[PDB]
Design a protein around this ligand. Structure first.
Ligand SMILES: *C/C=C(C)/C=C/C=C(C)/C=C/C1=C(C)CCCC1(C)C
Ligand SMILES: *C/C=C(C)/C=C/C=C(C)/C=C/C1=C(C)CCCC1(C)C
Ligand SMILES: CCCCCCCC/C=C\CCCCCCCC(=O)O
Ligand SMILES: CCCCCCCC/C=C\CCCCCCCC(=O)O
Ligand SMILES: CCCCCCCC/C=C\CCCCCCCC(=O)O
Ligand SMILES: CCCCCCCC/C=C\CCCCCCCC(=O)O
Ligand SMILES: CCCCCCCC/C=C\CCCCCCCC(=O)O
Ligand SMILES: CCCCCCCC/C=C\CCCCCCCC(=O)O
Ligand SMILES: CCCCCCCC/C=C\CCCCCCCC(=O)O
Ligand SMILES: CCCCCCCC/C=C\CCCCCCCC(=O)O
Ligand SMILES: [Zn+2]
Ligand SMILES: [Zn+2]
Lengths: 289, 289
């Protein structure tokens, strides 16, 4: 349990024992083959934040667990599986390399976070490209949606690994990739709203859109606030924030998507698949001929 | 120029000055806020390998440059743009953090490499999903192709960042993702061969398949041979090997793909788009009605 044992075994992760010499101008270290850096030893945050972070992580785990049990809708169960495995990794080695990368420039990069984005964010966007769940076509801009998002994560990760101005450059690059994703994602939500049958289906689509842009928009904000930004948030506080928006973006958004797909399925089962062309061009599900 | 200046300015990257004390049981270091690790100071390889690596990198750069000039075929120019930007980054900061990640466990992980895979490999697979270049449909297993590949890169990167058995676990996980990609990719090449018109088009498809599986299969092999494996290859030697198969997988494969798409285009322009159903189900381009 990393929540209990990290302070104990972090001595084995890297060098934590050192002696200051010559009025603090010299650091002396056991020649034991371990890497050393004072930056790595700095606090992750307060105990209150640490506690708050640990609570929400259990909640997400149970949420993901119940959702998995509850659950083609392969995209919904895939992200839940990743989220579950993530907690298992968090539970035992949250601040152990390389779940946290302690690099030579002093940075502490949460690779666990960025690796998860790589696994779940493209899948979420694939779901977005097929909100109705009807085989087999996707939008014309799904490939562009996927490429812009993966790139954005690469730039965000690279920005986190960097410092100073090079961090700024790769952040701004991720930002450019980000506006491309959102504009494309928005056009997908718009068409979806007019593709689904009028009624409750159009409500959840509106709800999924709100859940999407709010939650996803919070991530670059937290980046700026976190240790990889201007350090107003601790790494414990950064964890709290990410967990909250992980809840919205993956768990809640996934439930609504599944719920939306169920409604579509029951509709087509009852009324048949009947399309009315709407002016881009959209084939809208209707009830009567 | 990192090829010339790295030995000079690596003093500013991390601590390179230290004194052994007490019969080599104590290392003493300037208290200057820099990270220290003997593992980081180890040689990248021989000058012969370094020279060989630097030559092939220029070649790829010129190759990518000429290909860009030479060049919807958006996927071909996207990887060439990335490859060009990659060289520019290589030229100035090849062994500077975080192009190389110097982590607290002593590892030297080539993030530049893995970040590039994230950017170019999904795009290559998207191209693979649309070898004919005809709008707008892709295969049924493209989403599975993309997800399996991204995951595999995540596990490979995680494996490189790790050591010992956890490195082995994430390698084997990437391996499982890998066989999924190859089996799916193979089925795409098979259908493609029977979809394209009989003649030269079926030759290049066979050639692209050979280029694909040989080049892509070499990457996990080089992982095992490299510093992230059993260290038979130096980091300079690892660079040489990757550059050679970067040539095949991105540049050469991209040319053949573009060439294939040109042949398809000229065929449909001359003979029209005429399909004959072949038994999965494939709509085969033919010349006569
Ligand atoms: C479930 C996890 C999700 C949905 C994570 C999403 C992450 C982003 C939308 C990240 C965005 C960016 C940064 C953190 C920094 C650079 C700018 C962005 C937009 C690429
Ligand atoms: C242009 C660059 C390319 C095509 C890179 C491809 C990289 C791979 C196919 C990597 C494969 C793997 C490892 C390096 C280790 C774990 C096993 C694999 C298959 C995921
Ligand atoms: C998604 C997975 C991302 C990275 C997880 C890395 C966790 C590896 C923990 C190392 C174990 C150890 O330090 O002994
Ligand atoms: C920001 C700059 C671009 C990021 C996204 C690039 C995607 C290009 C592919 C789009 C497409 O042709 O479908
Ligand atoms: C928006 C800008 C985000 C980049 C963060 C700037 C500070 C760089 C740093 O903390 O080293
Ligand atoms: C949703 C909003 C997330 C806000 C995160 C703030 C963390 C507070 C812990 C200090
Ligand atoms: C694709 C790009 C992947 C990572 C490239 C990182 C290069 C950043 C170099 C840092 C510059 C410096 O050390 O001063
Ligand atoms: C190896 C284990 C699986 C890796 C690939 C998982 C892809 C699942 C999605 C496939 C699909 O439903 O189209
Ligand atoms: C195939 C196995 C690949 C994993 C490499 C095993 C050695 C681990 C190490 O070098 O620390
Ligand atoms: C294609 C094969 C790549 C082989 C790489 C071997 C590197 C040799 C440099 C020592
Ligand atoms: Zn720990
Ligand atoms: Zn350098």
């Amino acid at each position: 349990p990393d929540y209990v044992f990290h302070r104990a075994h972090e001595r084995m992760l890297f060098q934590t024992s050192y002696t200051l010499e010559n009025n603090g101008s010299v650091i002396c270290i056991p020649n034991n083959g371990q890497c050393f850096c004072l930056a790595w030893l700095k606090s992750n945050g307060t105990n209150a934040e640490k506690l708050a972070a640990n609570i929400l992580q259990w909640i997400t785990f149970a949420l993901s667990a119940l959702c998995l049990m509850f659950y083609c809708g392969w995209e919904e169960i895939y992200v839940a599986t990743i989220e579950m495995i993530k907690f298992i990794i968090e539970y035992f080695h949250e601040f152990d390399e390389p779940a946290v990368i302690y690099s030579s420039n002093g940075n502490k990069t949460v690779w666990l976070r960025y690796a998860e984005w790589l696994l779940t964010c493209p899948v979420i966007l694939i779901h977005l490209s097929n909100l109705t769940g009807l085989a087999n076509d996707y939008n014309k801009r799904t490939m562009g949606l996927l490429v812009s998002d993966i790139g954005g994560i690469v730039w965000a990760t690279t920005a986190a690994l960097s410092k100073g101005y090079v961090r700024v450059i790769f952040f701004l690059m991720g930002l450019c990739y980000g506006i491309y994703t959102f504009f494309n994602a928005a056009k997908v939500y718009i068409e979806a709203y007019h593709t689904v049958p009028k009624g409750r289906c159009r409500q959840v689509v509106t709800g999924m859109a709100w859940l999407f842009f709010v939650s996803w928009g919070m991530f670059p904000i937290l980046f700026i606030l976190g240790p990889e930004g201007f350090g107003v948030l601790s790494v414990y506080g950064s964890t709290v924030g990410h967990t909250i928006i992980d809840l919205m973006s993956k768990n809640c958004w996934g439930l609504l998507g599944h719920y939306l797909r169920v409604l579509i399925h029951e509709h087509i089962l009852i009324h048949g698949d009947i399309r009315k062309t709407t002016k881009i061009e959209v084939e809208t599900l209707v009830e009567d001929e």
